[PDB]
Each structure stands twice: as structure tokens, then as C-alpha cells.
Design a protein around this ligand. Structure first.
Ligand SMILES: CO[C@@H]1O[C@H](CO)[C@@H](O[C@@H]2O[C@@H](C)[C@@H](O)[C@@H](O)[C@@H]2O)[C@H](O[C@@H]2O[C@H](CO)[C@H](O)[C@H](O)[C@H]2O[C@@H]2O[C@@H](C)[C@@H](O)[C@@H](O)[C@@H]2O)[C@H]1NC(C)=O
Ligand SMILES: CO[C@@H]1O[C@H](CO)[C@@H](O[C@@H]2O[C@@H](C)[C@@H](O)[C@@H](O)[C@@H]2O)[C@H](O[C@@H]2O[C@H](CO)[C@H](O)[C@H](O)[C@H]2O[C@@H]2O[C@@H](C)[C@@H](O)[C@@H](O)[C@@H]2O)[C@H]1NC(C)=O
Ligand SMILES: *[C@@H]1O[C@H](CO)[C@@H](O[C@@H]2O[C@H](CO)[C@@H](O)[C@H](O)[C@H]2NC(C)=O)[C@H](O[C@@H]2O[C@@H](C)[C@@H](O)[C@@H](O)[C@@H]2O)[C@H]1NC(C)=O
Ligand SMILES: *[C@@H]1O[C@H](CO)[C@@H](O[C@@H]2O[C@H](CO)[C@@H](O)[C@H](O)[C@H]2NC(C)=O)[C@H](O[C@@H]2O[C@@H](C)[C@@H](O)[C@@H](O)[C@@H]2O)[C@H]1NC(C)=O
Ligand SMILES: [Ca+2]
Ligand SMILES: [Ca+2]
Ligand SMILES: [Mn+2]
Ligand SMILES: [Mn+2]
Lengths: 243, 243
């Protein structure tokens, strides 16, 4: 088939082999109940300078020459665990080529190589980043932020993420949707007894990514921080693109 | 304050007086556990030709002359109960002037008056409609659909709603978000063991609605159908509009 539909309500079924449903790259590992993105020592304490990725194993169809394009929705809950405030560097949900791998740690979030990070012509990746560190040198806004990245670590759009939520270590729920007809990517982040965060931007995936992509989570540290993905749902539809 | 934040996890607290938290107009009524939008007989059986609205009682700030504009997110679960297939006419989440009231029933969904429904200059309303009836005469697409309505019942954009979901009578969860910086309205509709529906469109609320609006649910019937709203959450933020 050309569309994908999966739901993982939790990850307490930690015994699946690497690469069969989810592929782990770099320092990302499967633990009981979670996809862990960067490295921790014996006590679950975060290591500095680490990067990892957990991605769905199958390729995801996005578009083809015949006009058919996939609209999609993904939701996931995560626990960004902080051991002080501030922490570094964050996490990201991404869509990249099937053949790509984890790249640099720190503020590049395992998605970019330091040398070509601010160069759109040298990257093929769209990511929604949940940034905990202000990298002054790569144009981060002066606060923790949520951002949409298109072929570069310098986000095409961002919205403020409050300190209390960014460094509070509570489980958060994210909803990311893409409408393939109007080329709109929307991010919704919610905290159970807190506030919501909304960020939407026009981006034509067909114009920046290949026809088939790999989807997943990528993180880069940094220090005093580690991200655990607790559940994940992905659904894509070709609705309205003549199919 | 200029922003709104409320959460109703369920409506089993049916004893609040009309107009204090929620205002009921037309045939909409408060019942144990739900906001009922149109009329039913003794047995909960749907009446033909009815319209009703349940709206938040306080005015909601949307924008002002000084550039400040509200981004928002609302979520709600609803049960669109069907007594056969097809049914008519649907429901809608809307934003209208504080002083407006319920209008015609049938395909106008309590939001428009038959005479001026296809005339944008005569209406001030933005609505996300969940349309169960194909009104050939008002340009409905040839299937049940979800649509975004801007000052007219003829939607500026729509996406297919499958027959099985539109007439299946299962509880569905909706997420509607508006980003005031990029002027994007997104609708996400999810069924627990089913599919998701995504529809997003650029619409500048500041350009079509007054500075303060009333928000709520509106329905119009039709026949063999009745909608119950089971929970409702609304959150708005001025984030990124210099405030
Ligand atoms: C003078 O540069 C600073 O040098 C140290 C040692 O090389 C860097 O910090 C170490 O490596 C980081 C990746 C991170 O694991 C950190 O905990 C560790 O001490 C430092 O990098 C910046 O550290 C920040 C946290 O204090 C944060 O993680 C930033 O993302 C990180 O900057 C990124 O990574 C560095 C190595 C460069 O590639 C930068 O272009 C990039 O933004 C160094 N700071 C600077 C400004 O480079
Ligand atoms: C010839 O027109 C048809 O006449 C009947 C009686 O006046 C209309 O049906 C009744 O009223 C409806 C509002 C609804 O309560 C229905 O159950 C009831 O029998 C009929 O209206 C259309 O009925 C459809 C369901 O069979 C559906 O509800 C449509 O939304 C409704 O059309 C709307 O309402 C009518 C009254 C007009 O204002 C239309 O412009 C509008 O789309 C009439 N059909 C038509 C095509 O008008
Ligand atoms: C899970 O399976 C992957 C293969 O599909 C592993 O990645 C591959 O690991 C090789 C080194 O063992 C490396 O040469 C390959 O290029 C790499 N594949 C990609 C796309 O990068 C993966 O290995 C982890 O991630 C790689 C990038 C290295 O950092 C390894 O040290 C890691 O083990 C496997 N993960 C695990 C936990 O087994
Ligand atoms: C809940 O309180 C509302 C007042 O804030 C009622 O609406 C008002 O009802 C008057 C008739 O009793 C009418 O003249 C007013 O114009 C109307 N207000 C608006 C904004 O329309 C509301 O009444 C229901 O809805 C109105 C439109 C009529 O259809 C009434 O018959 C309904 O009772 C009150 N709802 C209930 C259930 O009490
Ligand atoms: Ca950063
Ligand atoms: Ca209709
Ligand atoms: Mn950033
Ligand atoms: Mn319609």
C-alpha cells in the first residue's frame, strides 16, 4: 500500500529486534516503556555530547510525479527529562531521505553536520524541533522554542516555549499535521494541566523532500537532559490528491 | 485578562444556569453529560427542521488595532448520532460576533440565513463544519465532508469525510488550531480505532471577524440525526504578537 497507519499506545513491549518496526541509530536505545534518544550512565543520568535517532523502519510515501501526495498526522507523548535549568539541546520529529543517518550532536539535534547546517542546498530534511538551548551562533531566538526547520538548523518559523514547560520534565503530548493540498505543517504541543502551543507554517514537502522518506525522532545533547518517547501514532492519507 | 483557558472534561455537571458558563440558543439544550444541539422527542429520537447553538458565555478576544492577536487551540469530543444513512445536516464549531444568534436550520447549520448564505459581504462568521448532507444547490462536494467556512456556507476548502465515519455514530475527537502569526486554521478529526482527517487553510481572522467574538457549537437538521458535545477545551495565547 501507499499510505501508513500505526499506533504504539506505550512501548512496554521492549523486546522487538532493532530494525524490524523501529530502527535505532547512534546513541538511541530501546528501554522498557520508551524509546530513549541519547545516552545515559547506569543511574539514568544524562551523558554530555550525544546524538541518537529512533525512526520507523518502513519507508513512508510522500508524493509522486502523478500529483498524488500524502497528508499526514502523527501524535506522540514524550518526557524530556531535565536535571537542572537550563539544559541542552532538545529533540525533533523529522522526515528525511530513507538512506540518511544520525549526524552531529549538540544544537544540530542529530540532524545536521556542523559544516553545512545553515546551507539549505546541502540538506534534505524537514523537522519540528523542540529546542531547549539558545545557540546564539545559529540564530536561535532568545528563549526555549518550538521551531519548523526546512533544510537547515535555522528555523523558518518558531514560537516561544516557556521555561517552565521546556525545563519542567512533565509528559507532553504533541500533534503534528501536514495538509498536502494546502502545503501546511501544524504543530500542537499540550501539557495536561497547562498550556498549549501552536505553530503552523506553509511548506511544500514535495518541493523539499524525495518521494519516499524515513520518519522518526532525533535528539542531540548537550547536558543535563535526556528525552524518552512514550507513545507514537502515525496516519497518512492520499485524500484529495486525485486519489 | 485578554486570553481564555477552560476545560470541561465531560458535562456530567448539568446543573449550571443558562448563560453563566455556556449559553444555549434555539433548540440546543443542556442534558446530563452533554450539550445537545438540536431537538429530540421523549425517546431521544431526532426531530426534523431544527437548529441550536451552545456557545461559551464570555466574549473571546481575537485581535486589536495594536497588532496583538490571539492564537488558539480548542478540542472537543462529540457524538453525532445517526438513525440511518444518510442523515442531515451536520454540526459546526464557530466564531461569530458577540451579539449574533442562531439562524436557519437545515444545511445552513444554524449559522446562516437562507437569503444571504452565499454572500460573503452579508456575513461575519468563520466555522469549521462537519457536513453530513450534500446540498447540491449550495455547492457541497459530492460526499460527506469537513469544511472551513469563511462568511458563507460555500466552504473555502473541504476534505472528504468517509460515509462510515460520518454516519457511524462513534465518539470522535476534534482539534482545531489557529496560528495568529501565519494566519493558518487547522482541523484534525480523529476516531479512536479509525482514521484521522486533516484540513488546513490560510485565513486571517483579523480581516474577517471583529476584535471580540463568541465561540461555540452550532447545528442544523435535517433528519435522523442529533449531535451531542461531550467535552470541550479552549486555550488562547497572544504569543508572538508583540505580547
Ligand atoms: C567553545 O565551544 C564550546 O566548547 C565545548 C567543548 O568543545 C562545547 O560543549 C560541549 O559539546 C557540546 C556539543 C555539548 O555536549 C556540551 O554539553 C559540551 O560541554 C560547546 O558547544 C555548545 O554547548 C552548549 C551547552 O553548553 C550546547 O550543547 C550547544 O548546542 C553547543 O554548540 C554546538 O556544538 C558546538 C560543539 C559547535 O558545533 C556549535 O557550532 C554548536 O552550536 C562549545 N560552544 C560553542 C558556541 O561552540
Ligand atoms: C423542495 O424543497 C424541500 O422541501 C422540504 C420541505 O420544505 C425541505 O425539507 C425539510 O426541511 C429541511 C430543512 C429538513 O429539516 C428536512 O428534513 C425537512 O424534510 C428540503 O430541505 C432540504 O432537506 C434536506 C434533507 O432531506 C437537508 O436538510 C437540506 O439541508 C435541506 O435544504 C436546505 O433547507 C431548505 C429548506 C432550503 O432553505 C435549501 O436552500 C437548503 O439547502 C427542501 N429541499 C431543497 C433543495 O430546498
Ligand atoms: C540498528 O540497526 C541499524 C542498521 O539498520 C544500525 O545502524 C548501522 O550501524 C552500523 C554500525 O554497526 C553502521 O555502519 C551503519 O551505517 C548504520 N546504519 C545507519 C543508517 O546509520 C544501528 O546501529 C546504531 O547506529 C549506528 C549509526 C551506529 O552508531 C551503531 O553504533 C549503533 O549500534 C542499530 N542499532 C542498534 C542499537 O543496534
Ligand atoms: C439562554 O439564555 C439566552 C439569553 O442570553 C436565551 O436567548 C434569548 O432568548 C430570548 C427568548 O426567550 C430572545 O428574545 C433573545 O434574543 C435570545 N438571545 C439570543 C442571543 O438569541 C436563550 O433562549 C433560547 O434561544 C433563543 C434564541 C430562543 O430560541 C429561546 O426560545 C431559547 O430558550 C436561553 N436558552 C434557554 C434554554 O433558556
Ligand atoms: Ca538550539
Ligand atoms: Ca450540506
Ligand atoms: Mn532552534
Ligand atoms: Mn458543506
Amino acid at each position: 500500500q501507499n499510505t501508513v497507519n500505526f499506533t504504539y499506545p506505550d512501548f512496554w513491549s521492549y523486546s522487538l529486534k532493532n530494525g524490524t518496526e523501529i530502527t535505532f541509530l547512534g546513541d538511541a536505545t530501546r528501554i522498557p516503556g520508551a524509546l530513549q534518544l541519547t545516552k545515559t550512565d547506569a543511574n539514568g543520568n544524562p551523558v554530555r555530547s550525544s546524538a541518537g535517532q529512533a525512526s520507523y523502519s518502513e519507508p513512508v510515501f510522500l508524493w509522486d510525479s502523478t500529483g498524488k501526495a500524502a497528508s499526514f498526522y502523527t501524535s506522540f507523548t514524550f518526557l524530556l527529562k531535565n536535571y537542572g535549568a537550563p539544559t541542552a539541546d532538545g529533540l525533533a520529529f523529522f522526515l528525511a531521505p530513507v538512506d540518511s543517518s544520525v549526524k552531529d550532536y549538540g544544537g544540530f539535534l542529530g540532524l545536521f553536520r556542523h559544516e553545512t547546517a545553515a546551507d539549505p542546498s546541502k540538506n534534505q530534511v524537514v523537522a519540528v524541533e523542540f529546542d531547549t538551548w539558545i545557540n546564539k551562533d545559529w540564530n536561535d531566538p532568545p528563549y526555549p522554542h518550538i521551531g519548523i526547520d526546512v533544510n537547515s538548523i535555522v528555523s523558518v518559523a518558531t514560537t516561544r516555549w516557556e521555561n517552565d514547560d521546556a525545563y519542567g520534565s512533565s509528559i507532553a503530548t504533541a500533534h503534528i499535521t501536514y495538509d498536502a493540498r494546502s502545503k501546511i505543517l501544524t504543530v500542537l504541543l499540550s501539557y495536561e494541566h497547562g498550556r498549549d502551543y501552536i505553530l503552523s507554517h506553509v511548506v511544500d514537502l514535495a518541493k523539499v523532500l524525495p518521494q519516499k522518506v524515513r520518519i522518526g525522532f532525533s535528539a542531540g545533547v548537550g547536558y543535563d537532559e535526556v528525552t524518552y518517547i512514550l507513545s507514537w501514532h502515525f496516519f497518512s492519507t492520499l485524500d484529495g490528491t486525485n486519489k
